[model samples]
Target chain A: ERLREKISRAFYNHGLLCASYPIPIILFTGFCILACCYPLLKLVAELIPLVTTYIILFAYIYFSTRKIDMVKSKWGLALAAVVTVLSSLLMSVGLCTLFGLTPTLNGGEIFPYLVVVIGLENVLVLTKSVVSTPVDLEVKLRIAQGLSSESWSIMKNMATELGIILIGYFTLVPAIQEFCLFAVVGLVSDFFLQMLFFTTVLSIDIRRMELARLAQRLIMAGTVVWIGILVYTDPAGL
Target chain B: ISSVTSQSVNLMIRGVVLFFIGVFLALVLNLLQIQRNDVIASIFSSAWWVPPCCGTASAVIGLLYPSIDRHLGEPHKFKREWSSVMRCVAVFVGINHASAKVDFDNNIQLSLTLAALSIGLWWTFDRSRSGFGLGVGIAFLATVVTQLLVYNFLYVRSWLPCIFFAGGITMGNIGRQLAMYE
Candidate 1:
């Protein structure tokens, strides 16, 4: 119990630090690293579903929040959530490559999907808990309290998944072992990234709803332009 | 006497529901495999026998869960809902569909994939000893059946038996837990 409390307190302090940041510098750093590690065409193909799923998830979060806050700031919250998922995904893939793990055709295809599904659960849980907190508290306190409240369950799930990944890594199949390794790295990266980058983004958005709304529209336009460029660049129509 | 009659009727209903769920999943997943692989086969193909046989096995094993629970005196309190059970079914079918579509060099690799997936399914959804036991037992039986059929020249299939085992175990656990709720 002592150890758990210590870790929880550490997470809360970390959340405070994240919230204190004026800008989401950690998110930008992640994007820079992701850009440095250019993905293969096949991975780009997998991005379609990942991106689409997040779009739908963002819409769900936005509409669901309409009843609670009765404000358009829900867009910022939803965007932060989606960005957290997308950045963690890119970072995981980039980190896997940086660690010198090569992707197999089958495993590589499914890796992003697996990461998205696992990461989104924690993201949704944390978001819901944060939203559930009393609106009367300071934003920093709300963020710290929410982080501490759901951090244990998220950590428990991460630990369980890591154990399963270790089992898969030891299996005799080469493809599965690679997939497991990717999953292990991706999961670990996602945990830290969520705490650092996501909380920062969420805090910034909550502090300035107008700025968040502007950022949300920019992200939407950027996604459309990015997809358009990819399609136009593909010799065989995607 | 009324309680006994109601119990039997409920058991029958659970069994029937499990049977159809198994059949429906098998048929749909098989069609998915066929469509993805672009195989020139039909419902009359030799591989056709695999799904119905799985459904029948599902019915029998699903009926075993409540009895096993009773014998062990284990009260499962985790995730005891139909919604969870339905999600388990979906995940199980996804695993099976993955095995069907993913290319494998040998039957052993295929078996290993199914094994890993079965373990994953158990860990993710139902972590009870009974569920694990039934899954492993069904997997073993299905593997043996696969070998028998292959050796006897009845059919040359790889992952169907194990898929059936995994699917049936999931179905059985669902039925068992649902029965407990009643």
Candidate 2:
């Protein structure tokens, strides 16, 4: 009870503008990307299984890169972002060119890799976007309270729980270990990552926040569309 | 459609994305200490860069895998920019001849048809909104319901994303309305 009170006070001590709904929405976006976009790509392509595998392995890297906000080096941040994006695009192009239409339909493995690579790029983008942030610890507390907002938080919380439930469900399917890895661990990592990495990015600069968000959104839209088209054109994964 | 002009599908998607992005940018500029016109015209009109790049890529790709003949039965009508339950039902039924060259699919065309119908609903319900929360509730309800129905019934997937997007925009409007009202 004392710990709870302390945390609450810490979150709401200042007059910080609380924009908390993004949490559920972000995770929901991830899940949607996984479920909707993945399936769509799979239905259309043969490589999705491989793509999914990569996403699982690399989401961890993304989950960790969120830690970049603590370093405060624009150079490192920018490099990470650029490299992540370039590597992802290169991987896609290179593989497509090299494989040249092999009869592979393992999108569940392949798509996840694309996401992991792209996800790393996004985490870096979010990190790089931070400017000289002013940390009014009180503001942190207030934003933290986004977890308990009267209206939005409830749904967001429920969604989080649902994701956990789904992850557990996926765990039961041994054939889907890679999907299970990211689906389950990615959720937990993202929860902490957002709380720390994005929040740290929030601390360093507001422009980083907005730009990171905008870039992230654009990437998501693009990735979804790209995956959709690729999967539609070639249901094979090789 | 030649490969050059065939990118209209991608362009149209980009246009819609840009339009919404501009609206958001306008709001942000207004809220911040930034000017509207500078952001609006620059962001949407001239400065918008990503969409064009994506469009070019999509056009090139879309042209290579030409599969229009599969979708040649009925064309999407732009004349009726309004939607209702009846149109929703009609389009839902219209895709009865659904077929796909993919491994597995449900009448995924249903999601598209439903969202296309949503255009009509967007106009009709545009005025039905009283407040933001209520509006959001209604819009979210509409999209989710439409998505669930077609997804469950037709076993389709791709088409409903547009409907989900329509629902999402509605949710945003409702939130805006609610915030403005409150």
Candidate 3:
């Protein structure tokens, strides 16, 4: 309870953009992903306004918090973004060569979703770490050590749960199926990439609080634009 | 059957063993002038990856099967469960082969057939003092949803995974039961 409360405050004290909904809404995402990917399904048109309304409410929550924040290295932040994209692409290619055929299904359509989900997860964790970072370096070390110890086991659990769901449920479509396979394989890849590549590449680089916030906002905006393009194009149904 | 230590290890062993078996079968079929690969490649050439993929999947099932079975009241009896599954598969394929020209809603027929068969198998397993776990339910739901969705969204041969998943899920239930007991 303490940890949950502390973590929640550290992250959402600033704003509640995406409050978790477990059942009806999450299940609906699956239907939406399937339906919206095809144009005949005008569910996207209906959802666009509803989603926009929620996002607007979220923006209000964010701006109202209005914490004057600053950080050191714009370069560190910028490079991290670049590295994330490049590495993700490289990893995708590697996966394709290993597990997929050439001229893969859902080539570009799936990358943005991958980047957004994984990127947002990274930023959220970074935000949590930044916001809740203990002032005492020793305390920070203790916490990091504790977290590092259990990270692998947690990752394994993540892989298995997500993997089963993917292979079992998501293989209905070639594109979506490929996307799922990539995600399953990328679990291990992403974990190692972050540990080996991102950390080492961005070692000791300074960063700002607002940069993290900006990254979050930009990712959300990009996701919106990408989704709009998808809905507008309606590639699957046609 | 009694003091099973790590079901995960057990499953992995099964996967590895099955992978070898699949390879052997592939080879024997190939040498017998049957052209098993060609058959798969005919209607579903794109799934050329299925052979290796299935092998890989079998290995993964070892790890996944145990983790999923963790919650069930009965552990899966891999051998007994697989035998029933094999019976279902054999019947499914044998009938499908015999009636390849039947142009009706094959999915519906196969689903009905498997449903009946699976129910009978389930009832028998239950009466035999075996029980199924939640994992089997999850597998059943997952299997049906996926197969049905593919039936709708993709050009799936409806009768295909229906019978397969039906048998698999029934066996999974039995396996889950065994997973709990022994």
Candidate 4:
């Protein structure tokens, strides 16, 4: 029984980091939807909204993440959010526009079709925020680093404890314990890599420039990993 | 101007309110720990409106549970809890988007998607809270499949894009009618 929990924790933790961002998670949903219908070539033409939304997603991220410049990049977070929602909305619009004009397609049926897309995605954005960090992680990590070794030891232990309490409060449910476990399990690997493997990889002075590069790196790495995963995992991409 | 004004007013009453109510209930779920950045962004933009996550979570959980576990053959037999969580998420979203019940889109696909999903969802629930949940899940799945069909089916005539929506609702109804022995 405990072994199952451990395995669940291990697999779940990997998924946790990958799914920490909404786009990947949304892609997961899209892939799941498309996978079931893969044999049909018609699905290819029909999924233009899904494909274009994903392609434009890069534009959305660039604008929202404010990769244009670091100082204004925080504003990009807002951009990211707006663009994400708009992209979904655009997908809905695109779907309707494409199918509405089809000579063989019934116009009346498109209403519900768009409704499902908009409706499901909206709900995902709404409820999917679970496990998101309320504060900027850049700040949290910085705070953790500044503490004296004495304090550092306490913090390493304390962050986990604090993480639990805050998680419970934020989720507003008893199952928060499970979620807390989820976060801790995931963070453990990151912390481990940072301690053993990551430190060996390089050293950082930890400044604004470093932060910018780090963010870019995470995005780039995320993109590569997601694409690779999608290539095999996504029924459509597969 | 008059029509648009009345339309928005109606939308605020239905669309925005339902959206808020659903979010408010959603806030109660044990799973909704940290707020998503996307959610933060959304709340930041809604003028004065802050989403009621707990209420929305609660409402959605109330509406989404039954339909998920119904089929014994369902891949998620051992996943009651996970199913509950995902189902709540899906239904809450469906209801939130379907708010106002008014269709203003020039395109019929959007309208039909919402209608089919909402109608499928409506049938999932009756007077009971369980009904609400089943409706939400059924609608969520039905809408996704229906839209795909609308995108493909070539027999219907019209630039109207109506088939997708009509197909969504029909799919939703059928999904509801089919029982999974949970």
Candidate 1 versus truth, CA RMSD in Å, comes to 6.8
Lowest summed lDDT across 10 adjacent residues in model 4 chain B is found at B28-37
DockQ of 1: 0.11
In candidate 1, what are the lDDT values of residues A61-153, reduced to their tens digit? Answer: 444344224332454554455555545455555556665765544432353345334545566567668766766647777878888888779
Estimated TM-score per prediction? Answer: 0.66, 0.27, 0.31, 0.23
Please compute the TM-score of chain B alone for each predicted structure, in the order given.
0.78, 0.25, 0.45, 0.26
- Model 2 residue runs over 4 Å out of place are A1-5, A8-73, A78-181, A192-237, B1-182
Tens digit of lDDT per residue, candidate 2, span B1-182? Answer: 57767565554554454355434432322222212124334324324543443233223322221232124433222212212222222222222212221223334334444444455445433433332333344445544655565555343344334433343434333322222222
Query: How many residue pairs clash in each candidate at the backbone level?
Result: 0, 56, 12, 72
User: What does DockQ give for each predicted structure?
Assistant: 0.11, 0.03, 0.01, 0.03
* Per-residue lDDT of candidate 3, residues A151-174 (tens digit): 444455566547453643433434
lDDT at A221, model 2: 49
Q: Which residue segments of model 1 deviate by more than 4 Å?
A: A26-30, A37-83, A94-119, A204-238, B1-21, B28-44, B56-117, B136-162, B173-182
Q: On residues B1-182, what C-alpha lDDT tens digit does candidate 1 reach at each position? A: 99999989988888888788777656555555554421233532446676678678888887877777878796667744543454555456456556644565567766666677777767666777667767667777887776787665211455656675677667677767777767
The residue pairs found clashing in candidate 1 are none
- Writing each residue's lDDT as its tens digit, candidate 2 over A1-238 gives 3754554454444213233333454454445434423323333122222233333344444444445445424434433343334323323432343333432335433343334322443343323332323333433443344332322332344364445446435433332333333334444444443443344334333435333443454345445555554554454433
Q: Give the Cα error of residue A160 in candidate 1, in Å.
A: 2.9
lDDT of 3 by residue, B1-182 (tens): 33464765665455566566444433322232222224334423323544664345333433344455466544444434332333332333323332332233435544554344445444533332323343245455645665665555221444434434433433444334334443
Native-referenced Cα lDDT, model 1: 0.61
Q: Report fnat in order of the candidates.
A: 0.00, 0.00, 0.00, 0.00
Ranked candidates (TM-score, high to low): 1, 3, 2, 4
